Amino acid sequence: HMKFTVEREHLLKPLQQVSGPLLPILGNLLLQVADGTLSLTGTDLEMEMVARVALVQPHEPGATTVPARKFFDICRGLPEGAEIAVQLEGERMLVRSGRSRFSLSTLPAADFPNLDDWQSEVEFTLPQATMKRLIEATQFSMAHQDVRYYLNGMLFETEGEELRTVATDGHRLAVCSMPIGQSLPSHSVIVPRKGVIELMRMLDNPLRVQIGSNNIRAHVGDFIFTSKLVDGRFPDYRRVLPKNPDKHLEAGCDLLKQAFARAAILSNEKFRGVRLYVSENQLKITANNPEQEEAEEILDVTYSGAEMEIGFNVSYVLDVLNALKCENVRMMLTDSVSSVQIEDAASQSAAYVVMPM
Amino acid sequence: HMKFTVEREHLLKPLQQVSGPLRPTLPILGNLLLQVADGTLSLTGTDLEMEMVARVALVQPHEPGATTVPARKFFDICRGLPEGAEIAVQLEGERMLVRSGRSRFSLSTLPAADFPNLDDWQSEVEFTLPQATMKRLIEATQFSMAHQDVRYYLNGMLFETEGEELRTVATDGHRLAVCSMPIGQSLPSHSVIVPRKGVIELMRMLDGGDNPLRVQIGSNNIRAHVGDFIFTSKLVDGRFPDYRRVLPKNPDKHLEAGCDLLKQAFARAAILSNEKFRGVRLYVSENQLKITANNPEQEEAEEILDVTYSGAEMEIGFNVSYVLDVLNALKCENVRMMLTDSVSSVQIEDAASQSAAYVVMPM
Amino acid sequence: QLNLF
Amino acid sequence: AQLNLF
């Protein structure tokens, strides 16, 4: 029955990737030798990650499941360049290399959880860098463990020739759109928070994406990731974007980040409120706490609108600025009770909307 | 009232060092004591058990006085400021105003008179030694300290001066580490126990450069000076175990093997040992070591290694973590196992050096 | 901290 | 399982 012999460095990166998503069967990896190929699959029932390793040595077809973390740690603990020999034998898999011998327990491959067949309704390819940019630009705005399950995920929207990602936790929002070269149908789904984290780590140049009505799949090199989609209806970003900001402020991304990072130190540990005074070519950031401590930062910026005060959760601001790895930032204000739009001054690819305190 | 103006890079390293003992409980303990006197700023942090004092020469106009300020806020402020920033401090009200460029901060204070004070004590033993020696002595044994044993005395490290050697010992009852190093001076016989936190802060004051370490040890305290930094700790009360007496009485069986090969053998076997108990089994035979491990899952691993051994055959079990710990600490090429029988402890050493011995008890 | 909508 | 010294 199942047998293969492979170099350790052939297995390390795949075993690692498919272990990402991790009942006892769920702690196991499905192993499948077929057609001169080993397949490794890991699953949490919501999503699954499949890796393929070409087998250039004698092998025999078959399948079993083995504990993921013990199998990885064994192959990782083995010396650089080792030949790992695997074979199934009743209720145990045997892994052998030099005078190192291991006997792992198995669970039947028939028992291993399957994600049901589904149909792709939307298909496109795009470079990995673009999938990264889209996820990096908005991931941080996802709600963590909100009862609004539809917020514990990321919207993926295809519109015209653009793929767009949206993320919000109700208090702040991030939207990023990137051009992809093929006219696409209108389609809008929510990928769960975990799937977004997993799909992000498989980027590590073309990714092929397939999207059904309750499923998303990403093919990347020798990896196939698939996830359930989150049920429900995501908020419309067109509708959170400030209606028409009249007041535009420009400043250095780093100088602004650092002013805020310093003010943040003496803001409320709970609420993290800082105050912004905008005036002709100047931003005053202030913070105070229950200790009666206070910080005050004055910056030169480019602004000529009217004067206004506005408060913010400084962490929301720092998050945005940390994600905008750029030179100058654009703050788009309206009034002291309305949200602000923040953008890279040189690029409209990504917008950020943060609600005031 | 206190005033000083200083470059940021003058304050970074000191603020960092004295913030060591700093979860939050008793507000004054989250504060640093600041003292301008005699052209010098002193910064003191404390947890009541230990304290660390840093001195900064003041080359700019200053005025004497003292106050306390939150340590972490004051550090984060100075760390947050740009390179080369001038940091101007003053007092008005019960606050401390810190100013650099157009960045302005107002910190709350607590009176300096309220700041906790480790009582005066007398040095009875004094020596210097290189920082690299203090490091080696701590790194070689730190890991054998007991975690939170009700024998308070095992939750610490023995520091023993004898003849021309400083020695450290550490044990949790099951395993033991002893390291001795020469320091070029004739010393009196003395033994003290430095607490867990004291060993951490002290290992952490070792910047790893040239300044030698000046130690002073008293009846219930210890102090180390390096540069313009001064660490002081209470000692743990009680009587530490005698290492002379744990060391196997006379091992007859000596085994040599590669440190890395033996480590990786055990690390691999460890994967399929009992998660709770972590038992592995050793079978020594002429020039060979078999390591095996099994678990409730009926899984097993087996590693065979070539070694240098010609004694009698024997089986012996070990907590594999204790073994791995020792081997991780012995950053060397070949190891020496010194066995007696299956019910007796083993002594492990670097094969090239007798500076450090390790005794681990069998399962 | 206020919610959108 | 694992004995103390002494």
Is A99 within 8 Å of chain B by CB?
A: yes
DSSP A70-111: HHHHHHHHS-TT-EEEEEEETTEEEEEETTEEEEEE-B-GGG
Closest CA to B178 of B6, B28, B350: B350
DSSP letter at A200?
H
CA A226 to chain centre: 14
Side-chain half-sphere CA neighbours of A337 within 13 A:
1
Is B241 within 8 Å of chain D by CB?
A: yes
Identify whether the C-beta of residue A260 lies closer than 8 Å to the C-beta of residue A247: no
Experimental approach: X-ray
Distance CA B171, CA B158 (A): 9
Resolution in A: 2.5
User: Which CATH superfamily includes the segment(s) A1-119?
Assistant: DNA Polymerase III, subunit A, domain 2 (3.10.150.10)
Cα B206–Cα B207–Cα B213 angle in degrees, nearest 5:
50
Q: What is the C-alpha R_g of chain A?
A: 25
For residue B7, give the amino acid letter.
Answer: E
Q: What is the C-alpha R_g of chain C?
A: 5
Identify whether the C-beta of residue B91 lies closer than 8 Å to the C-beta of residue B62: no
Q: What is the largest CA-CA distance in chain B?
A: 80
3 state SS for chain B: CCEEEEEHHHHHHHHHHHCCCCCCCCHHHHEEEEEEECCEEEEEEECCCEEEEEEEECCCCCECEEEEEEHHHHHHHHHHCCCCCEEEEEEECCEEEEEECCEEEEEECECHHHCCCCCCCCEEEEEEECHHHHHHHHHCCHHHCCCCCCCHHHCEEEEEEEEEEEEEEEECCCEEEEEEEEEEEEEEEEEEEEEHHHHHHHHCCCCCCCCCEEEEEECCEEEEEECCEEEEEECCCCCCCCHHHCCCCCCCEEEEEEHHHHHHHHHHHHCCCCCCCCEEEEEEECCEEEEEEECCCCCEEEEEEECECCCCCEEEEEEHHHHHHHHHHCCCCEEEEEECCCCCCEEEEECCCCCEEEEECCC
Architecture of domain B247-363: Roll (3.10)
Distance CA B12, CA B31 (A): 16
Query: Does C1 contact A173 at a Cβ distance shorter than 8 Å?
Result: no
For residue A178, give the amino acid letter.
Answer: M
Distance CA B127, CA B293 (A): 48
Which option is the CATH number for B1-122: 3.90.79.10, 3.30.200.100, 3.40.50.300, 3.10.150.10? 3.10.150.10
Kindly report the CATH number that applies to the domain delimited by A120-240: 3.10.150.10
Q: DSSP H helical segments within A2-80, as ranges?
A: 8-19, 68-77
Side-chain half-sphere CA neighbours of A216 within 13 A:
25
Backbone angles phi, psi at B310, to 5 degrees: -130, 10
The H or E element containing residue A144 is none
Query: Does B345 contact D2 at a Cβ distance shorter than 8 Å?
Result: no
Q: Which of B176, B246, B361 sits opposite D2 (nearest CB)?
A: B361
Chain C residues with CB under 8 Å of A313 CB are 1
**Residue carrying structure tokens 């990786």:** B264
Nearest 10 degrees: Cα torsion B261, B266, B272, B278: -170
Backbone angles phi, psi at B267, to 5 degrees: -60, -40
Closest CA to B292 of B316, B310, B275, B321: B316
Is A77 within 8 Å of chain B by CB?
A: yes
Residues with Cβ within 8 Å of A286's Cβ and at least 6 positions away in sequence, in order, are A263, A274, A275, A277, A294, A295, A296, A297
Query: Does D3 contact B277 at a Cβ distance shorter than 8 Å?
Result: no
Chain A residues with CB under 8 Å of B102 CB are 297-299
Q: Give the domain ranges of chain A.
A: 1-119, 120-240, 241-357
Tokens of B141: 């044994």
Tokens of A237: 């970003």
Chain B residues with CB under 8 Å of D2 CB are 174, 277, 319, 361, 363
Tokens of A87: 């074979």
For an interface test with A, give the residue of C2, C3, C4 to mutate (most A CBs within 10 A). C4
Identify whether the C-beta of residue A346 lies closer than 8 Å to the C-beta of residue A327: yes
Distance CA B343, CA B173 (A): 16
Closest CA to A17 of A49, A55, A52, A61: A49
**β-strands B123-129, A206-211: how paired?**
unpaired
Strand partners, B222: B217, B233
Architecture of domain A241-357: Roll (3.10)
Distance CA A312, CA A333 (A): 12
Distance CA B77, CA B247 (A): 52
Is A313 within 8 Å of chain C by CB?
A: yes
DSSP letter at D4?
P
Residues of chain A by 3-state class (helix, strand, coil), percent to 5: 20, 45, 30
Residues with Cβ within 8 Å of B195's Cβ and at least 6 positions away in sequence, in order, are B49, B50, B155, B156, B233, B234, B235, B236
Is B277 within 8 Å of chain D by CB?
A: yes
**CATH topology identical between A1-119 and A120-240:** yes
Chain A residues with CB under 8 Å of B264 CB are 77, 79
Identify whether the C-beta of residue A146 lies closer than 8 Å to the C-beta of residue A197: no
Distance CA A196, CA A199 (A): 5
Query: Does C3 contact A170 at a Cβ distance shorter than 8 Å?
Result: yes
Residue B211 CB neighbours (<10 A) = 15
Residues of chain C by 3-state class (helix, strand, coil), percent to 5: 0, 0, 100
Distance CA B235, CA B220 (A): 5
Is B26 within 8 Å of chain A by CB?
A: no
Identify whether the C-beta of residue B188 lies closer than 8 Å to the C-beta of residue B125: yes
Q: Which of A74, A266, A294 sits opposite B268 (nearest CB)?
A: A74
Distance CA B334, CA B352 (A): 7
Residue B119 CB neighbours (<10 A) = 7
Residue B298 CB neighbours (<10 A) = 11
Across the beta sheet with B300-306, the strand order is A3-7, A83-89, A92-97, A100-105, B300-306, B288-294, B279-285, B314-319
Tokens of A355: 């609600």
Identify whether the C-beta of residue B211 lies closer than 8 Å to the C-beta of residue B13: no
Chain C residues with CB under 8 Å of A352 CB are none
Kindly report the CATH number that applies to the domain delimited by B123-246: 3.10.150.10
> Minimal Cα–Cα distance from D6 to chain B, Å?
8
**β-strands B356-360, A282-288: how paired?**
unpaired
User: Counting beta carbons within 10 angstroms of the beta carbon of residue B165, is it exposed (0 to 12), middle (13 to 18) or buried (19 or more)?
Assistant: middle
Identify whether the C-beta of residue A37 lies closer than 8 Å to the C-beta of residue A54: yes
Is A96 within 8 Å of chain B by CB?
A: no
Count of H-run helices and E-run strands, chain A: 6, 23
Region of B203 on the Ramachandran plot (φ > 0 left; ψ -120 to 50 alpha; else beta): alpha
Is B287 within 8 Å of chain A by CB?
A: no
Distance CA B264, CA B362 (A): 20
